[PDB]
Amino acid sequence: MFENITATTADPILGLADLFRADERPGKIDLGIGVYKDETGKTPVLTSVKKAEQYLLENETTKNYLGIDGIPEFGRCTQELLFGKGSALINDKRARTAQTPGGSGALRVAADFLAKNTSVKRVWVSNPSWPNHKSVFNSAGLEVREYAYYDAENHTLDFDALINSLNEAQAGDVVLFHGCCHNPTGIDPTLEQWQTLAQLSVEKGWLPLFDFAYQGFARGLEEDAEGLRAFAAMHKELIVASSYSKNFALYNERVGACTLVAADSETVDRAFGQMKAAIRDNYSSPPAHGASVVATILSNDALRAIWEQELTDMRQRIQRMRQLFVNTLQEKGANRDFSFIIKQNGMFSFSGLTKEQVLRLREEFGVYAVASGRVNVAGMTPDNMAPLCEAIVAVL
Amino acid sequence: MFENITATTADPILGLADLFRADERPGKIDLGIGVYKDETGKTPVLTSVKKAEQYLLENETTKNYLGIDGIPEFGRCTQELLFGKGSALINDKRARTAQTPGGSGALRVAADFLAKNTSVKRVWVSNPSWPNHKSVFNSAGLEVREYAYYDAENHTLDFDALINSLNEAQAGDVVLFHGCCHNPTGIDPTLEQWQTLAQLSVEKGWLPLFDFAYQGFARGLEEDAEGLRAFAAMHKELIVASSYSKNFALYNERVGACTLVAADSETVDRAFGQMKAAIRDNYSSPPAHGASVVATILSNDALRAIWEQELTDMRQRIQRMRQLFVNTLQEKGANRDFSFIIKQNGMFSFSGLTKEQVLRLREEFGVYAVASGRVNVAGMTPDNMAPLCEAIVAVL
Ligand SMILES: O=C(O)CCc1ccccc1
Numbered sequence: 016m017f018e019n020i021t022a023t024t025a026d027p028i029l030g031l032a033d034l035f036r037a038d039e040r041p042g043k044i045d046l047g048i049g050v051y052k053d054e055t056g057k058t059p060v061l062t063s064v065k066k067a068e069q070y071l072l073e074n075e076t077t078k079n080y081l082g083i084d085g086i087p088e089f090g091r092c093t094q095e096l097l098f099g100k101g102s103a104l105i106n107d108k109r110a111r112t113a114q115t116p117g118g119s120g121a122l123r124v125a126a127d128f129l130a131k132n133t134s135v136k137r138v139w140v141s142n143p144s145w146p147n148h149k150s151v152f153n154s155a156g157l158e159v160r161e162y163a164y165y166d167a168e169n170h171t172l173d174f175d176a177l178i179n180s181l182n183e184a185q186a187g188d189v190v191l192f193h194g195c196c197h198n199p200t201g202i203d204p205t206l207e208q209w210q211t212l213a214q215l216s217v218e219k220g221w222l223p224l225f226d227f228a229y230q231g232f233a234r235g236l237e238e239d240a241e242g243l244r245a246f247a248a249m250h251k252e253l254i255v256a257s258s259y260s261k262n263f264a265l266y267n268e269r270v271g272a273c274t275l276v277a278a279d280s281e282t283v284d285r286a287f288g289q290m291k292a293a294i295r296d297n298y299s300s301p302p303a304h305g306a307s308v309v310a311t312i313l314s315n316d317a318l319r320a321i322w323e324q325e326l327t328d329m330r331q332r333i334q335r336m337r338q339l340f341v342n343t344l345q346e347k348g349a350n351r352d353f354s355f356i357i358k359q360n361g362m363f364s365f366s367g368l369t370k371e372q373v374l375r376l377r378e379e380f381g382v383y384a385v386a387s388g389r390v391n392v393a394g395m396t397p398d399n400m401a402p403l404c405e406a407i408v409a410v411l
Numbered sequence: 412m413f414e415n416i417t418a419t420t421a422d423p424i425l426g427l428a429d430l431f432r433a434d435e436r437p438g439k440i441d442l443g444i445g446v447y448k449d450e451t452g453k454t455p456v457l458t459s460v461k462k463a464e465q466y467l468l469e470n471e472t473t474k475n476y477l478g479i480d481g482i483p484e485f486g487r488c489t490q491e492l493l494f495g496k497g498s499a500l501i502n503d504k505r506a507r508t509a510q511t512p513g514g515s516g517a518l519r520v521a522a523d524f525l526a527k528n529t530s531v532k533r534v535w536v537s538n539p540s541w542p543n544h545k546s547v548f549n550s551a552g553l554e555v556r557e558y559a560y561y562d563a564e565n566h567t568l569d570f571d572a573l574i575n576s577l578n579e580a581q582a583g584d585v586v587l588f589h590g591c592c593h594n595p596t597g598i599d600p601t602l603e604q605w606q607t608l609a610q611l612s613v614e615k616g617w618l619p620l621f622d623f624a625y626q627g628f629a630r631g632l633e634e635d636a637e638g639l640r641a642f643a644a645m646h647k648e649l650i651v652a653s654s655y656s657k658n659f660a661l662y663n664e665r666v667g668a669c670t671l672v673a674a675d676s677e678t679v680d681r682a683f684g685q686m687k688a689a690i691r692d693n694y695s696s697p698p699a700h701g702a703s704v705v706a707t708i709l710s711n712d713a714l715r716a717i718w719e720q721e722l723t724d725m726r727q728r729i730q731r732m733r734q735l736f737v738n739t740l741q742e743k744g745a746n747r748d749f750s751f752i753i754k755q756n757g758m759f760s761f762s763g764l765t766k767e768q769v770l771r772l773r774e775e776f777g778v779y780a781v782a783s784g785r786v787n788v789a790g791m792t793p794d795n796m797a798p799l800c801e802a803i804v805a806v807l
């Protein structure tokens with residue numbers, strides 16, 4: 016049965032770790048997968064996470080199965096982060112949260128739930144795009160269409176092209192939005208743009224799906240949720256697939272959430288029953304450790320303030336690497352204006368490298384960016400900056 | 412888009428956790444979900460597990476993503492536990508293991524893999540079966556057929572009927588076997604029957620899939636793997652969905668494995684690529700914490716001797732409860748001979764109780780069993796035995 020299985024296209028991002036590891040060039044540099052690094056080029060455990068885990072070591076008395084939807088206090092903390100403490104969504108009990116294995120898990124759960132229980136047939140995603148969106152949604156039998164998003168001459172959100180692109184999108188189509196730190200462009204709608212989009216989505220009868228993996232990385236926790244909250248103020252229904260992988264540097268514990276919102280409690284509770292059925296046929300119930308850490312941190316005043324400052328330190332270091340990055344490129348002999356890189360949010364820099372230029376950075380310099388030309392600014396340090404910028408300049 | 416979604420109960424068995432929880436009667440007894448309890452009626456974290464978490468707290472330096480297939484040492488330890496240390500499957504590099512969130516996650520991964528990459532159309536499952544086998548495989552678009560298994564008269568394998576009912580299983584069909592402690596019946600093939608079954612499937616051209624969640628709970632670690640290894644010795648191709656939820660009392664950390672076996676190394680690597688693609692389309696990569704614990708324990712000599720003793724203590728306690736259970740059924744004047752229960756492997760007794768008797772147990776006595784009549788013997792203590800036995804006696 017297995018002799019004739021055909022090999023797959025390597026994943027443009029995930030496949031990068033093996034290719035990087037196998038490269039024998041001394042001085043190779045990994046700017047691929049979006050993991051935050053410190054000044055030393057390490058990805059450490061957060062001290063607030065270590066404190067929470069020590070707490071769990073001392074105090075946990077069982078590993079008994081969580082509910083299918085996970086730790087209740089986790090869902091409750093997720094909803095405050097997403098919607099704001101005194102939110103009308105929370106007071107009206109209009110939202111149900113399933114703790115999932117990562118925002119990835121939340122995406123797949125959303126996709127299965129929608130394919131099995133609704134009339135949804137397509138999801139609209141942005142180009143440039145995050146590859147797993149089309150992969151996850153297609154696997155659940157959903158068709159995926161692209162909307163336009165980016166002006167590549169100006170390195171700007173092309174707002175009219177976004178809207179014109181979606182003239183197409185019908186009532187009961189899903190439209191996917193990145194809550195902040197658009198992956199890969201780093202360009203986000205303004206508040207006013209978020210409000211226009213929200214109003215258009217209501218009028219068009221779209222079902223909004225927010226992929227929210229970077230809360231805290233654009234401007235800060237509350238300001239990063241403005242876009243989502245503006246959609247939340249307008250809509251009877253939406254889904255949020257959120258992650259704690261990046262904001263807690265908890266990548267490998269797979270901590271995320273699928274939040275369902277509907278017009279009232281009755282409806283959301285009833286629809287959430289079928290979300291649980293979608294999880295049943297998948298991984299059955301979610302992993303306790305990472306979510307308990309996040310719930311422990313978010314529930315304790317003192318721990319939370321420790322985490323919040325760690326998060327801003329992460330964000331400030333990336334801002335510093337972005338200034339250093341555009342400065343070093345100039346100094347290494349790039350003509351070009353690269354100031355547009357300073358105003359991209361999140362972990363990445365995106366300009367306009369072709370696949371050919373990316374492959375050359377790799378073969379010739381051992382510098383690994385993603386096939387799309389996306390570079391991990393958060394993987395840059397004062398020590399790799401010079402060789403990495405020299406590599407980039409040579410391929411321009 | 413959500414208003415017409417219909418009320419449902421998701422997982423029937425996990426659904427019992429809630430039914431049990433919401434019940435306000437103080438003498439309620441839980442005999443549903445297969446979770447081990449100690450003498451005090453608690454589900455403690457294992458000492459070996461606490462020791463491992465302690466080590467991890469003290470020594471982990473990163474939460475950077477695992478590879479799609481998880482911790483390499485976890486994979487190694489799994490295949491050794493599965494196939495034996497000297498195995499030709501290991502030396503010949505014919506097996507690839509992905510760490511998954513539970514054996515449940517492994518079943519889903521296996522099903523998507525098959526649905527997507529092979530011409531497998533149907534999966535044959537025992538009668539009776541674990542309920543989630545059917546819904547998992549159906550969710551991936553695979554027909555599920557039933558084979559004869561349990562002789563509900565002799566409380567025995569109806570082996571000849573099993574072979575008759577599999578006559579129509581075609582070359583390239585999947586046949587699902589439980590590695591040991593068949594759930595729910597507690598009746599496993601003998602080694603000789605396993606050997607007959609291994610011969611037949613080679614002859615018939617079936618793809619065997621093993622659900623192996625109870626290694627160590629029938630007779631012991633190596634003894635329980637005998638059926639699997641008799642299949643491994645004969646087959647070109649094979650899939651194992653194994654779990655550490657029960658043997659490490661680690662239910663909520665979601666620790667399992669999907670093992671793929673093919674004829675040679677090139678074949679298994681090319682197909683495993685597509686297994687990785689099925690995971691990428693799903694939760695992307697598995698949770699580190701639980702599997703780290705298991706890898707920590709299995710690769711350190713003293714730590715694993717502590718674990719094996721704890722597992723021995725779990726099995727030995729269950730057997731003492733089985734004996735106490737039939738004896739006190741008798742003493743309470745039971746109107747059927749329940750000595751057949753002594754012969755069942757694992758955590759359960761499949762007792763022959765009807766749906767009516769199950770509902771009356773729940774309603775009159777606050778004793779909660781699975782609707783099939785399966786009761787969790789591992790949830791029985793000396794303290795709850797007499798009340799639960801008077802309950803069963805009254806409904807017979
Ligand atoms: O590099 C990224 O885009 C973020 C990390 C990631 C990559 C692929 C799947 C899940 C998370």
Ligand SMILES: O=C(O)CCc1ccccc1
Pocket residue numbers: 299422424425443444445446515541543594
């Ligand atoms: O009770 C059982 O059959 C074992 C525990 C379990 C139940 C449902 C999903 C995963 C594991």
